[PDB]
Amino acid sequence: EGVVRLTKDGQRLRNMIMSFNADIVARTPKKKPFFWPEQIAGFEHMYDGNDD
Amino acid sequence: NRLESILSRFDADWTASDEARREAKNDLFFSRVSQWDDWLSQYTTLQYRGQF
């Protein structure tokens, strides 16, 4: 046995956890408000993201 | 005869030190092959078994 045989499990688990967390970062929808379509009827352009 | 005496002596010595032999063999296997001493659970069900 060398030196990289006994660290395989921990390294694989580290890689899997980092991959799962990257998936969480990428595919999770961000924080946006919950609006009824009738609450903002005619006001849709106000919440686009502009600062006008 | 000689054969019977030799086998009797060997059997006495083997049986006297059985438990120490088994414990030392386990220590060798644990520190050289793997720390999951599962003779059974080889087809029971495949579950994660880390080596840390």
Coordinates of C-alpha atoms in Angstrom, one line a residue:
Chain A
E1 CA 0.0 0.0 0.0
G2 CA 1.2 3.5 -0.8
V3 CA -0.2 6.8 0.6
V4 CA -3.2 7.5 -1.6
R5 CA -5.0 4.1 -1.0
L6 CA -6.2 4.9 2.5
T7 CA -7.5 8.4 1.7
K8 CA -9.8 7.3 -1.2
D9 CA -13.0 7.1 0.8
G10 CA -12.6 10.6 2.4
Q11 CA -11.6 12.2 -0.9
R12 CA -14.5 10.6 -2.8
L13 CA -16.9 11.7 -0.1
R14 CA -15.4 15.3 -0.2
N15 CA -15.9 15.4 -4.0
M16 CA -19.5 14.1 -3.8
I17 CA -20.4 16.6 -1.1
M18 CA -18.9 19.5 -3.0
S19 CA -20.7 18.4 -6.2
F20 CA -24.0 18.1 -4.3
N21 CA -23.6 21.6 -2.8
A22 CA -22.7 23.0 -6.2
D23 CA -25.9 21.5 -7.6
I24 CA -27.8 23.1 -4.7
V25 CA -26.1 26.5 -5.5
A26 CA -26.9 26.2 -9.3
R27 CA -30.4 24.6 -9.5
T28 CA -32.1 26.1 -6.5
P29 CA -34.5 29.0 -7.4
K30 CA -33.4 32.3 -5.8
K31 CA -35.3 34.4 -3.4
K32 CA -38.1 36.3 -5.2
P33 CA -41.5 37.5 -3.8
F34 CA -44.7 35.5 -4.0
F35 CA -47.3 37.6 -5.7
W36 CA -50.8 36.8 -6.8
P37 CA -51.4 37.7 -10.5
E38 CA -54.2 40.1 -9.4
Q39 CA -52.0 41.9 -6.8
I40 CA -49.7 43.3 -9.5
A41 CA -52.1 43.5 -12.5
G42 CA -51.0 46.5 -14.4
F43 CA -48.0 47.0 -12.2
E44 CA -45.8 44.3 -13.7
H45 CA -43.2 46.7 -15.1
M46 CA -42.6 48.1 -11.6
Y47 CA -41.1 44.9 -10.3
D48 CA -38.9 44.1 -13.4
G49 CA -35.7 45.2 -11.6
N50 CA -35.4 48.7 -12.9
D51 CA -34.8 51.6 -10.5
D52 CA -37.1 54.1 -12.3
Chain B
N1 CA 4.5 -44.1 17.6
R2 CA 6.3 -40.8 16.7
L3 CA 3.4 -39.6 14.5
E4 CA 0.8 -39.8 17.4
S5 CA 3.1 -38.1 19.9
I6 CA 4.0 -35.2 17.5
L7 CA 0.3 -34.7 16.6
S8 CA -0.7 -34.7 20.2
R9 CA 1.9 -32.1 21.1
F10 CA 1.0 -30.0 18.2
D11 CA -2.7 -30.2 19.0
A12 CA -2.1 -29.3 22.6
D13 CA 0.0 -26.3 21.6
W14 CA -2.5 -25.2 18.9
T15 CA -5.5 -25.4 21.3
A16 CA -3.7 -23.7 24.2
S17 CA -3.0 -20.6 22.2
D18 CA -6.1 -20.5 20.1
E19 CA -7.7 -17.3 21.4
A20 CA -4.4 -15.3 21.2
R21 CA -3.8 -16.6 17.7
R22 CA -7.3 -15.5 16.6
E23 CA -7.0 -12.0 18.2
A24 CA -3.6 -11.5 16.6
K25 CA -4.9 -12.6 13.2
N26 CA -7.8 -10.1 13.6
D27 CA -5.3 -7.4 14.4
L28 CA -3.3 -8.2 11.3
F29 CA -6.4 -8.2 9.1
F30 CA -7.8 -5.0 10.7
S31 CA -4.5 -3.1 10.2
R32 CA -3.6 -4.5 6.8
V33 CA -6.7 -5.4 4.8
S34 CA -9.8 -3.7 6.0
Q35 CA -11.5 -2.5 9.2
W36 CA -14.9 -3.9 8.3
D37 CA -14.6 -7.4 9.5
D38 CA -17.9 -8.6 7.9
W39 CA -17.5 -12.2 6.9
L40 CA -21.3 -12.0 6.6
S41 CA -23.1 -9.1 5.0
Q42 CA -21.5 -9.7 1.6
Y43 CA -24.8 -10.1 -0.3
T44 CA -27.2 -9.1 2.6
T45 CA -27.7 -5.5 1.2
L46 CA -25.2 -3.0 -0.2
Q47 CA -24.8 -0.1 2.2
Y48 CA -22.1 2.5 2.5
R49 CA -19.2 1.4 4.7
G50 CA -16.6 4.1 4.9
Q51 CA -12.9 3.6 5.7
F52 CA -11.8 6.6 7.8

